[PDB]
UniProtKB/Swiss-Prot annotation, chain A:
Belongs to the XPC family. It is found in: Cytoplasm; Nucleus. This is DNA repair protein RAD4. It comes from the Eukaryota. The chain holds residues 90 to 151 of 754 of the full protein. Involved in nucleotide excision repair of DNA damaged with UV light, bulky adducts, or cross-linking agents. Present with 876 molecules/cell in log phase SD medium.
Curated annotation (Swiss-Prot), chain B:
Belongs to the TFB1 family. The gene is TFB1. The chain holds residues 2 to 72 of 642 of the full protein. It comes from the Eukaryota. Component of the 7-subunit TFIIH core complex composed of XPB/SSL2, XPD/RAD3, SSL1, TFB1, TFB2, TFB4 and TFB5, which is active in NER. The core complex associates with the 3-subunit CTD-kinase module TFIIK composed of CCL1, KIN28 and TFB3 to form the 10-subunit holoenzyme (holo-TFIIH) active in transcription. An additionnal subunit, TFB6, plays a role in the dissociation of the SSL2 helicase from TFIIH after transcription initiation. TFB1 interacts with XPC/RAD4. XPC/RAD4 recruits TFIIH to the NER machinery. Interacts with the NER 3'-endonuclease XPG/RAD2. Residues 65-72 have a biased composition (Basic and acidic residues). This is General transcription and DNA repair factor IIH subunit TFB1. It is found in: Nucleus. Present with 5150 molecules/cell in log phase SD medium. Component of the general transcription and DNA repair factor IIH (TFIIH) core complex, which is involved in general and transcription-coupled nucleotide excision repair (NER) of damaged DNA and, when complexed to TFIIK, in RNA transcription by RNA polymerase II. In NER, TFIIH acts by opening DNA around the lesion to allow the excision of the damaged oligonucleotide and its replacement by a new DNA fragment. In transcription, TFIIH has an essential role in transcription initiation. It comes from Saccharomyces cerevisiae (strain ATCC 204508 / S288c) (Baker's yeast).
DNA sequence: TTGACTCAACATCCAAACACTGCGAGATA
């Protein structure tokens, strides 16, 4: 609330490649859904 | 008016003055008439809060620490 | 800038029939 409004101002110094099958299916479904929407 | 200007604390006018003369360089708030005094050791200040320009209420807030002997 | 290799780690396809109840362990008023 008070930190949400009043922004903290500070100087903090600081010196293979194939996914799972679940992701495969999720990508196929999301592809379809997205296509339809487009 | 760089490390020491006119600052408020507990609704009373004041004169902030950073005290960097000791091992802990601190922030001394000194009332404008001198009624209330409040010294803030910047050593414990975790981060500063400034009412950004979007915060037309120009209020800066000094975020402090939770030392092992203070934890609630 | 191209695609045909190989590698390895999965994924995916595809085959295609035995019954079901008896019988000894311990325990039992």
């Amino acid at each position: 609330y008070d930190s949400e409004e009043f922004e903290d101002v500070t100087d903090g110094n600081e010196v293979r490649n194939v996914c799972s099958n679940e992701e495969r299916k999720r990508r196929k479904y999301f592809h379809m859904l997205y296509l339809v929407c487009l | 008016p760089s490390h020491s200007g006119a600052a408020i604390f507990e609704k009373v006018s004041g004169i902030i003055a950073i005290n960097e003369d000791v091992s802990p360089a601190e922030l001394t708030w000194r009332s404008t008439d001198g009624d209330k005094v409040h010294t803030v050791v910047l050593s414990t200040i975790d981060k500063l809060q400034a009412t950004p320009a979007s915060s037309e209420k120009m209020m800066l807030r000094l975020i402090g620490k939770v030392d092992e002997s203070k934890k609630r």
